[PDB]
């Protein structure tokens, strides 16, 4: 009943799994957003050039 | 394929539940993934899947 209690109220102890999805998810968003960068081009979007 | 008044892309055009105001010409959910155009003739909102 304490095990049922401690995980149905507190959300902090699930942080170990929560990091792994978050460490996955931060890499995905920064993977896509690099297309907004020019790398010294006149435009970051490809279709304009 | 589609070309709009400055912005362009390629995909399927279907209906939508999202709403606009008198000023929008563009639409993206997160991290420059353009998905929503209210058309410049019928003034009717669409999605880009």
Describe this structure as you would to a colleague.
The structure is cut from a larger assembly and holds chains A (49 residues) and B (49 residues). With 49 residues, chain A is mostly helical. Chain A is built from 2 helices and no strands. Chain A has helices at residues 2-9, 15-32. The longest helix of chain A is centred in the middle third of the chain and has 18 residues, at 15-32. The termini of chain A are far apart. Chain B has 49 residues and is mostly beta strands. Chain B contains no helices and 5 strands. Chain B has strands at 2-3, 8-9, 13-14, 36-38, 45-48. Chain B has a 3-stranded antiparallel beta sheet with strand order 3-5-4, with no helix packed on it. Chain B has a two-stranded antiparallel sheet with strand order 1-2. The radius of gyration of chain B is 10 Å and the shape is globular. Chain B starts with a strand and ends with a strand. Chain A binds chain B through residues 29, 32-33, 35-36, 47, and chain B through 8-9, 30-33. Chain A: Residues 1-39 are annotated as: Heptad repeat 1. Chain A: It comes from Severe acute respiratory syndrome coronavirus 2. Chain A: Residues 18-49 form a coiled coil. Chain A: This is Spike protein S2'. Chain B: This is Spike protein S1. It is classed as protein binding.
């Amino acid at each position: 009943g304490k095990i049922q209690d401690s995980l149905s109220s507190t959300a902090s102890a699930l942080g170990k799994l929560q990091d792994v999805v978050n460490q996955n998810a931060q890499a995905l968003n920064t993977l896509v957003k690099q297309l907004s960068s020019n790398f010294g081009a006149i435009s970051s979007v490809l279709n304009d050039i | 394929n589609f070309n709009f008044n400055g912005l362009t892309g390629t995909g399927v055009l279907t209906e939508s539940n999202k709403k606009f105001l008198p000023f929008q010409q563009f639409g993206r959910d997160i991290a420059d993934t353009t998905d929503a155009v209210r058309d410049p003739q019928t003034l009717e909102i669409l999605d880009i899947t």
